[PDB]
Scaffold this motif. Structure first.
Motif, PDB file in Angstrom:
ATOM      1  N   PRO A 109       0.755  -1.258   0.000  1.00 47.86           N
ATOM      2  CA  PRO A 109       0.000   0.000   0.000  1.00 47.86           C
ATOM      3  C   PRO A 109       0.781   1.301   0.000  1.00 47.86           C
ATOM      4  CG  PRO A 109      -0.206  -1.123   2.102  1.00 47.86           C
ATOM      5  CD  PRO A 109       0.315  -2.119   1.102  1.00 47.86           C
ATOM      6  N   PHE A 110       0.046   2.349  -0.325  1.00 49.29           N
ATOM      7  CA  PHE A 110       0.608   3.668  -0.314  1.00 49.29           C
ATOM      8  C   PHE A 110       0.651   4.228   1.091  1.00 49.29           C
ATOM      9  CE2 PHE A 110      -1.355   3.419  -4.368  1.00 49.29           C
ATOM     10  CZ  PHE A 110      -0.315   3.840  -5.170  1.00 49.29           C
ATOM     11  N   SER A 111       1.752   4.915   1.375  1.00 50.17           N
ATOM     12  CA  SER A 111       1.856   5.575   2.633  1.00 50.17           C
ATOM     13  C   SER A 111       1.818   7.073   2.382  1.00 50.17           C
ATOM     14  CB  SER A 111       3.142   5.097   3.312  1.00 50.17           C
ATOM     15  OG  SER A 111       4.332   5.162   2.552  1.00 50.17           O
ATOM     16  N   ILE A 112       1.090   7.799   3.224  1.00 46.35           N
ATOM     17  CA  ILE A 112       1.007   9.252   3.214  1.00 46.35           C
ATOM     18  C   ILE A 112       2.323   9.589   3.919  1.00 46.35           C
ATOM     19  CG2 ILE A 112      -0.339  11.121   4.209  1.00 46.35           C
ATOM     20  CD1 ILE A 112      -1.842   9.930   1.948  1.00 46.35           C
ATOM     21  N   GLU A 113       3.194  10.428   3.387  1.00 50.60           N
ATOM     22  CA  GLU A 113       4.485  10.724   3.964  1.00 50.60           C
ATOM     23  C   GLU A 113       4.646  12.215   3.860  1.00 50.60           C
ATOM     24  OE1 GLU A 113       7.288   8.441   4.582  1.00 50.60           O
ATOM     25  OE2 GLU A 113       5.484   7.251   4.878  1.00 50.60           O
ATOM     26  N   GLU A 114       5.445  12.781   4.792  1.00 47.22           N
ATOM     27  CA  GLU A 114       5.803  14.194   4.695  1.00 47.22           C
ATOM     28  C   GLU A 114       7.011  14.147   3.738  1.00 47.22           C
ATOM     29  OE1 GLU A 114       3.682  16.325   6.713  1.00 47.22           O
ATOM     30  OE2 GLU A 114       4.585  18.203   5.916  1.00 47.22           O
ATOM     31  N   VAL A 115       6.819  14.999   2.730  1.00 45.52           N
ATOM     32  CA  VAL A 115       7.633  15.087   1.526  1.00 45.52           C
ATOM     33  C   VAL A 115       8.049  16.544   1.335  1.00 45.52           C
ATOM     34  CG1 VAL A 115       6.644  15.343  -0.898  1.00 45.52           C
ATOM     35  CG2 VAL A 115       7.252  13.073   0.031  1.00 45.52           C
ATOM     36  N   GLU A 116       9.195  16.686   0.753  1.00 48.70           N
ATOM     37  CA  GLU A 116       9.720  17.983   0.495  1.00 48.70           C
ATOM     38  C   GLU A 116       9.819  18.048  -0.991  1.00 48.70           C
ATOM     39  OE1 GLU A 116      12.846  16.950   3.384  1.00 48.70           O
ATOM     40  OE2 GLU A 116      13.100  19.153   3.204  1.00 48.70           O
ATOM     41  N   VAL A 117       9.361  19.164  -1.514  1.00 45.20           N
ATOM     42  CA  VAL A 117       9.213  19.422  -2.925  1.00 45.20           C
ATOM     43  C   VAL A 117      10.189  20.581  -3.248  1.00 45.20           C
ATOM     44  CG1 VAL A 117       7.437  20.166  -4.599  1.00 45.20           C
ATOM     45  CG2 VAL A 117       6.780  18.581  -2.839  1.00 45.20           C
ATOM     46  N   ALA A 118      11.405  20.224  -3.740  1.00 46.25           N
ATOM     47  CA  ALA A 118      12.419  21.193  -4.166  1.00 46.25           C
ATOM     48  C   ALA A 118      11.899  22.257  -5.130  1.00 46.25           C
ATOM     49  CB  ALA A 118      13.544  20.494  -4.862  1.00 46.25           C
ATOM     50  N   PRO A 119      12.405  23.495  -5.167  1.00 50.25           N
ATOM     51  CA  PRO A 119      12.024  24.486  -6.155  1.00 50.25           C
ATOM     52  C   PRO A 119      12.437  24.092  -7.587  1.00 50.25           C
ATOM     53  CG  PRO A 119      13.972  25.210  -5.100  1.00 50.25           C
ATOM     54  CD  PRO A 119      13.409  24.076  -4.286  1.00 50.25           C
ATOM     55  N   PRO A 120      11.649  24.577  -8.578  1.00 50.18           N
ATOM     56  CA  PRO A 120      11.846  24.393 -10.018  1.00 50.18           C
ATOM     57  C   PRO A 120      13.152  24.870 -10.596  1.00 50.18           C
ATOM     58  CG  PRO A 120       9.604  25.173  -9.675  1.00 50.18           C
ATOM     59  CD  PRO A 120      10.375  25.287  -8.354  1.00 50.18           C
ATOM     60  N   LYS A 121      13.884  24.046 -11.317  1.00 52.38           N
ATOM     61  CA  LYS A 121      15.029  24.565 -12.023  1.00 52.38           C
ATOM     62  C   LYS A 121      14.568  25.233 -13.361  1.00 52.38           C
ATOM     63  CE  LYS A 121      18.792  22.367 -11.681  1.00 52.38           C
ATOM     64  NZ  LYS A 121      19.888  21.417 -11.941  1.00 52.38           N
ATOM     65  N   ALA A 122      15.414  25.543 -14.354  1.00 52.07           N
ATOM     66  CA  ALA A 122      14.935  26.246 -15.530  1.00 52.07           C
ATOM     67  C   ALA A 122      13.999  25.338 -16.302  1.00 52.07           C
ATOM     68  CB  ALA A 122      16.079  26.635 -16.453  1.00 52.07           C
ATOM     69  N   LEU A 136       6.443   9.080 -14.769  1.00 52.08           N
ATOM     70  CA  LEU A 136       6.085   9.548 -16.111  1.00 52.08           C
ATOM     71  C   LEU A 136       6.167  11.054 -16.135  1.00 52.08           C
ATOM     72  CD1 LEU A 136       5.070   6.689 -16.716  1.00 52.08           C
ATOM     73  CD2 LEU A 136       2.769   7.543 -17.051  1.00 52.08           C
ATOM     74  N   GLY A 137       7.184  11.610 -15.483  1.00 59.85           N
ATOM     75  CA  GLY A 137       7.340  13.056 -15.391  1.00 59.85           C
ATOM     76  C   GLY A 137       6.134  13.843 -14.858  1.00 59.85           C
ATOM     77  N   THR A 138       5.224  13.257 -14.099  1.00 66.60           N
ATOM     78  CA  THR A 138       4.091  13.945 -13.525  1.00 66.60           C
ATOM     79  C   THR A 138       4.058  13.815 -11.994  1.00 66.60           C
ATOM     80  OG1 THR A 138       2.677  11.996 -14.252  1.00 66.60           O
ATOM     81  CG2 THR A 138       2.498  13.973 -15.516  1.00 66.60           C
ATOM     82  N   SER A 139       4.105  12.582 -11.448  1.00 67.32           N
ATOM     83  CA  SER A 139       3.935  12.262 -10.027  1.00 67.32           C
ATOM     84  C   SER A 139       2.780  13.007  -9.370  1.00 67.32           C
ATOM     85  CB  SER A 139       5.207  12.552  -9.296  1.00 67.32           C
ATOM     86  OG  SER A 139       6.073  11.512  -9.667  1.00 67.32           O
ATOM     87  N   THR A 140       1.533  12.853  -9.837  1.00 66.79           N
ATOM     88  CA  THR A 140       0.488  13.710  -9.362  1.00 66.79           C
ATOM     89  C   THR A 140      -0.169  13.264  -8.047  1.00 66.79           C
ATOM     90  OG1 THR A 140      -1.164  12.699 -10.740  1.00 66.79           O
ATOM     91  CG2 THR A 140       0.072  14.084 -11.868  1.00 66.79           C
ATOM     92  N   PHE A 141       0.214  12.174  -7.351  1.00 71.72           N
ATOM     93  CA  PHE A 141      -0.285  11.803  -6.013  1.00 71.72           C
ATOM     94  C   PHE A 141       0.490  12.514  -4.876  1.00 71.72           C
ATOM     95  CE2 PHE A 141      -1.540   7.162  -7.322  1.00 71.72           C
ATOM     96  CZ  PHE A 141      -2.744   7.582  -7.825  1.00 71.72           C
ATOM     97  N   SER A 142       0.728  13.792  -5.044  1.00 72.03           N
ATOM     98  CA  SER A 142       1.486  14.602  -4.148  1.00 72.03           C
ATOM     99  C   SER A 142       0.684  15.861  -4.115  1.00 72.03           C
ATOM    100  CB  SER A 142       2.842  14.881  -4.695  1.00 72.03           C
ATOM    101  OG  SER A 142       3.577  15.716  -3.842  1.00 72.03           O
ATOM    102  N   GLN A 143       0.871  16.589  -3.033  1.00 71.35           N
ATOM    103  CA  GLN A 143       0.114  17.799  -2.859  1.00 71.35           C
ATOM    104  C   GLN A 143       0.713  18.921  -3.687  1.00 71.35           C
ATOM    105  OE1 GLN A 143      -0.023  18.063   1.657  1.00 71.35           O
ATOM    106  NE2 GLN A 143      -2.217  17.850   1.592  1.00 71.35           N
ATOM    107  N   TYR A 144       1.983  18.791  -4.066  1.00 74.60           N
ATOM    108  CA  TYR A 144       2.709  19.724  -4.908  1.00 74.60           C
ATOM    109  C   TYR A 144       3.584  18.837  -5.743  1.00 74.60           C
ATOM    110  CZ  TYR A 144       1.457  23.781  -2.315  1.00 74.60           C
ATOM    111  OH  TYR A 144       0.659  24.714  -1.727  1.00 74.60           O
ATOM    112  N   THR A 145       3.878  19.224  -6.971  1.00 76.19           N
ATOM    113  CA  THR A 145       4.730  18.418  -7.832  1.00 76.19           C
ATOM    114  C   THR A 145       5.471  19.331  -8.775  1.00 76.19           C
ATOM    115  OG1 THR A 145       4.879  16.435  -9.003  1.00 76.19           O
ATOM    116  CG2 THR A 145       3.139  17.806  -9.832  1.00 76.19           C
TER     117      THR A 145
END
Ligand SMILES: NC(=O)c1csc([C@@H]2O[C@H](COP(=O)(O)CP(=O)(O)OC[C@H]3O[C@@H](n4cnc5c(N)ncnc54)[C@H](O)[C@@H]3O)[C@@H](O)[C@H]2O)n1
Ligand SMILES: NC(=O)c1csc([C@@H]2O[C@H](COP(=O)(O)CP(=O)(O)OC[C@H]3O[C@@H](n4cnc5c(N)ncnc54)[C@H](O)[C@@H]3O)[C@@H](O)[C@H]2O)n1
Ligand SMILES: [Zn+2]
Ligand SMILES: [Zn+2]
Ligand SMILES: [Zn+2]
Ligand SMILES: [Zn+2]
Lengths: 374, 374
Positions: free
Chosen positions: B20-33, B141-150
């Protein structure tokens, strides 16, 4: 004279499979309504005729084979519009009845009165215009062109150019039109494209020509038999590859070769392994692959549906996808306009009595096309 | 605030297959160019996500799955043209890089920067914008949309209508667009045609809609599960047939039904038997058959090449053959113009924390589509 009376002529009868053809005195009944009776001038020998003789192509025997041919109209039955005596014509093994599902549809050409799907070996009314000593002989694909005279329905005859060389335009009755149509009309080869032709017998040389007419900028001919490469070059192959030269797969050395796989790929070999190979080496997201011909006893191939998932198209066709009555005129008009040369494809012309002699050549393979003159 | 700084949010991590999927605290780095970082609003659950979890779809783990989704742009990295913060967007799992073979070609859509062919599970520069406790988490697939931010590259994000209902247009990010595109853009269903749709899950209902948009005059829905017929009817099936009702074959009772076989046939079941069945019951001389989807562990089917010989076309496609950046805007504009209703297809919306709960439904099958709201 002839008009209205039965004709008595020589034709080659296959009394039973896997036996040779016999030249027999045959009587050719007069045309009923919408029939035309043709005097044959030249007939090509195609492997589909030979398929009949092995039993592979099941049709009613005894039969008069032949389907690739041009001749001259002797009588025309009551209610015939399209032709007149003395017209040069090409018998059509794919009829163009005008009225059906497939005939009205702007891409279907395989007329619903075809005698391939379920061979009856008769004229459209369920009967034979042939008898050899009382015994009825069956018609083949509504043409039976290995006879000195034959009767065809009006949906199976096409009028052509009276100045046309019938000892060369007879190829347009099947072999050339099946291959050139695959490149020009079925795959719709585009200008600049990179085509891979598999197998380089006479239908394969026709494909190469199609590709050339369409303006492909690269036509790779491929054949395990090295000896086929010159004529292929001659007719348009920019390069030629022999599969036994490499250690790698051929679809690998072709996609590698082509930076991502070729645009269009055509299989004119007729076997399962190279059909699926020819699928894999045209481009993943928009490559098109045409099976030009598949033999009558075909088994099932194993292919992984995955090769279609990315966007490959896989098509098959009979007679180059051409609507028969419509196109065979325009393909002669074109040949008359000095575009194709059927000449590289004719490698032996025999007299019609050497019919069995013409098949042995077919069967040992050094013969592109044999024409039987009447 | 956020712009430029790492974000810390909940996302569902698959630490390893068949867990199963675990809800985890994740850090979403800022966008490069040429990256944009999205705030997710709604994500659909598709079987392709679930394919990852069985190991069927092999991609690098640990992973954040999700590919069907719409959200709102939070920061945009340096050199981004197409989007601005606050724009509603749809992540695209088929990128539209603009420059390649497939991107210039007027029918190829499966961009050459896709991460399906060989999954790396990273951003275009070979790196992850995600870390859960120091450990890197792979992108999907370059999306990872099961995150609150991506974070997505600029070739994988499409701007859409600011008035658009994101809890419904998220379907256009995969499921609806894969099926409607198969009828509208891949097979090019024509007005008057007779279409047979195989399988009637949510992608199948999308196909039915495509067929309807194209103007088919008969859309036969077919499913061994009777219970799927009403919604199908509701969305455009003129009739519906259950294969276990007959004693005959289904391709027989369909061609019989259709006087010669249907024009277009679509398989949205994904198995080998009905893919080949769906080939045989579209018209012999001009029938077209689209495999809308084929699962990742597909074996080889056995098909007799003979079914192509008469003139059938067999195509496959990813994302309804649509060029992603190009079309997802126009499909929302259309939805905004009250043409499709994504509404019959949404049968459950959960909160994003019930992700595993959303998959159990997927897996027992009574759920057309589940939307996970953020
Ligand atoms: N039965 C049909 O409807 C039909 C149409 S085309 C076709 C196949 O083509 C033949 C007729 O067409 P054609 O003019 O090309 C005559 P041919 O039989 O000579 O065609 C086969 C060609 O493929 C080449 N070849 C054989 N195996 C390979 C291989 N494994 N890889 C690469 N090249 C190979 C042969 O050298 C030959 O040039 C038939 O005998 C049959 O084998 N069958
Ligand atoms: N993996 C892919 O890329 C992909 C795309 S569509 C696809 C298949 O479709 C599913 C997802 O698409 P979907 O929205 O339709 C969901 P679903 O799995 O519900 O699709 C299968 C449909 O076919 C029906 N069905 C099953 N077997 C038969 C049969 N033998 N004959 C007739 N009808 C049958 C089922 O009732 C169902 O409606 C996946 O689980 C997979 O099985 N796979
Ligand atoms: Zn032939
Ligand atoms: Zn017809
Ligand atoms: Zn999906
Ligand atoms: Zn691209």
């Amino acid at each position: 004279s002839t008009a209205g009376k039965v004709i008595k002529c020589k034709a080659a009868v296959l009394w039973e499979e896997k036996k040779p053809f016999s030249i027999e005195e045959v009587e050719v009944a007069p045309p009923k309504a919408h029939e035309v009776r043709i005097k044959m001038v030249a007939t090509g020998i195609c492997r589909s005729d030979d398929h009949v003789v092995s039993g592979t192509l099941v049709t009613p025997l005894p039969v008069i084979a032949g389907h690739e041919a041009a001749g001259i109209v002797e009588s025309i039955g009551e209610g015939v519009t399209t032709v007149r005596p003395g017209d040069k014509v090409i018998p059509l093994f794919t009829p163009q009845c005008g009225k059906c599902r497939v005939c009205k549809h702007p891409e279907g050409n395989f007329c619903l009165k075809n005698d391939l799907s379920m061979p009856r070996g008769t004229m459209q009314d369920g009967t034979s215009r042939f008898t050899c000593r009382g015994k009825p002989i069956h018609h083949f694909l509504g043409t039976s062109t290995f006879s000195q005279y034959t009767v065809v329905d009006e949906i199976s005859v096409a009028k052509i150019d009276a100045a046309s060389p019938l000892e060369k335009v007879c190829l347009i009755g099947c072999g050339f039109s099946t291959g050139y149509g695959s490149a020009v009309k079925v795959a719709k080869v585009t200008q600049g494209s990179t085509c891979a032709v598999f197998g380089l017998g006479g239908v394969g040389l026709s494909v190469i020509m199609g590709c050339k007419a369409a303006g492909a900028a690269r036509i790779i001919g491929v054949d395990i038999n090295k000896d086929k490469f010159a004529k292929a070059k001659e007719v348009g192959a920019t390069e030629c590859v022999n599969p036994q030269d490499y250690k790698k797969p051929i679809q690998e050395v072709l996609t590698e070769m082509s930076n991502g796989g070729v645009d269009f790929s055509f299989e004119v070999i007729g076997r399962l392994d190279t059909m699926v190979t020819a699928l894999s080496c045209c481009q993943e997201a928009y490559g098109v692959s045409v099976i030009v011909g598949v033999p009558p006893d075909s088994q099932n191939l194993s292919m992984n549906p995955m090769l279609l998932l990315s966007g490959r198209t896989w098509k098959g066709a009979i007679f180059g996808g051409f609507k028969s009555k419509d196109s065979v005129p325009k393909l002669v008009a074109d040949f008359m306009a000095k575009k194709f040369a059927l000449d590289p494809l004719i490698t032996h012309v025999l007299p019609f009595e050497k019919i069995n002699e013409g098949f042995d050549l077919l069967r040992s393979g050094e013969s592109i096309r044999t024409i039987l003159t009447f």
